[PDB]
Design a protein around this ligand. Structure first.
Ligand SMILES: COc1cccc(OC)c1C(=O)N[C@@H]1C(=O)N2[C@@H]1SC(C)(C)[C@@H]2C(=O)O
Ligand SMILES: COc1cccc(OC)c1C(=O)N[C@@H]1C(=O)N2[C@@H]1SC(C)(C)[C@@H]2C(=O)O
Lengths: 137, 139
């Protein structure tokens, strides 16, 4: 009712903590920070402007500016305006999938693939609506 | 390869949840004169009390990039040290207003679902959260 909201928050806080730790080394091997990493996973999904990234995150523009220019200098991202993933950046996102997929299956090897289907359909509709309300405001 | 698709969506889904909250709490954060990251701190202290390390490694961010956020809130009088770190009154009102916003939207975004549907959804996310936590413990 309202603790679904709390749960959701606690669930998201947990996933972030698991991801930070599991991707700890990779990020070090790349010289990329956690701050930057999220931008890379965020761009895996879309080609965004530093503003788009800044609003889709609520943090200080300067901070997003600093991290994007670091990703360019690292050739982990590139230009059109558009800030999209470069191929070296893409391999990180693939080295990231591989590690996520490995632990994810571990924890879901016993689920009913169909139970999950209905659960996913519910989330796609909520997601669909989340994107809808979000446009500006 | 089947899980990869679910993982992508989960990441997208969480991606949007974060995005939405950011747009939805901006004006309230501005009203209280705080940054979003400063809000997370208050939010993380709404569920239970914490110290610096606890938080600094909870979402593993920089060294002196947690400390600064911490003392700022003491000065804003939204948090209290009674290291130790817990929420204050003006901070409790913040979370109040915050939850009110998150509950209207989430409700009216869920209200047409069959409670049984929502409950099933949560039961699945609860078991994943459960398995996540235990994994974290093993590092
Ligand atoms: C637009 O952002 C900036 C503007 C002006 C000066 C800046 O630092 C000199 C930066 C910046 O991003 N500094 C980053 C920081 O912190 N850094 C990096 S560079 C570093 C000093 C080697 C150290 C690290 O990465 O190890
Ligand atoms: C999980 O949020 C993040 C995830 C990953 C990196 C992040 O940047 C450090 C943040 C973040 O700072 N988020 C902002 C913050 O703090 N937040 C907002 S969204 C919120 C979590 C509901 C809470 C609030 O405003 O109530």
């Amino acid at each position: 009712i309202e603790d679904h909201i709390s749960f959701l928050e606690k669930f998201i806080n947990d996933v972030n903590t698991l991801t930070a730790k599991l991707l700890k080394d990779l990020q070090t091997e790349y010289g990329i920070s956690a701050e930057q990493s999220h931008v890379l996973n965020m761009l895996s999904i879309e080609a965004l402007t530093v503003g788009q990234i800044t609003e889709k995150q609520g943090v200080n523009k300067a901070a997003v500016s600093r991290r994007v220019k670091k990703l360019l200098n690292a050739e982990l991202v590139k230009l059109e305006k558009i800030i999209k993933l470069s191929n070296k950046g893409k391999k990180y996102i693939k080295e990231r999938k591989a590690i996520m997929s490995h632990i994810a299956s571990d924890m879901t090897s016993d689920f009913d693939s169909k139970e999950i289907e209905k659960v996913r359909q519910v989330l796609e509709i909520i997601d669909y609506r989340i994107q809808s309300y979000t446009s500006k405001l």
